Amino acid sequence: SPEQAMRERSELARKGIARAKSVVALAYAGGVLFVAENPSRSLQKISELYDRVGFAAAGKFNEFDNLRRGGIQFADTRGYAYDRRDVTGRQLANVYAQTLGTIFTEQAKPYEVELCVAEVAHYGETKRPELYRITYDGSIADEPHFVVMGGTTEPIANALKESYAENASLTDALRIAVAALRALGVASLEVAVLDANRPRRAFRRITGSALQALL
């Protein structure tokens, strides 16, 4: 029965996605901000994908890190094959959707993962930040303001719904994101930005004492 296998795989995955920490990504004046609840110091849920494309995930670490690696592979092979400015967040999101659909239908167990691909404009350029959310089945959704992944997404999504403000500075967006995430110190937070002002590589982690000052 295709219906029972579809429904059951869906439940399996959605469970393991709610069975994990929470990540948020939101647009602010200087680009995009990733704020994840992460206790470990070695295992990370936020990553650079390409010059202006960042990546956050929530679920089973070995699998979304498998996807992290695959995406890095893809982006670099394209950038070298054509050029750096040809790789876009949109292509990456689409590849993740195809791959999560194929995994969801063909592999034994579906990837209990939820992805968010983020993109900002190039240096000295003007364009709105783009957020995409890719779910375990292959579905892809275009988000204008913020993405919330993993755990219980309702209270965080609503708190962000009340607190969000376009063109908020880095500190305000950090306060809003940590507040809505609580609905945690520098020893339990993974914070990075897609700073639109950097010349080439936009991704930049905010850790330690600098993070301490910001929050």
């Binding site: 579809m6 959707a97 659909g101 969801f104 779910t135 089945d137 292959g138 892809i140």
Partner: peptide, 5 residues
Amino acid sequence: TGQYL
């Protein structure tokens, strides 16, 4: 499943 257009 998903990705319906």
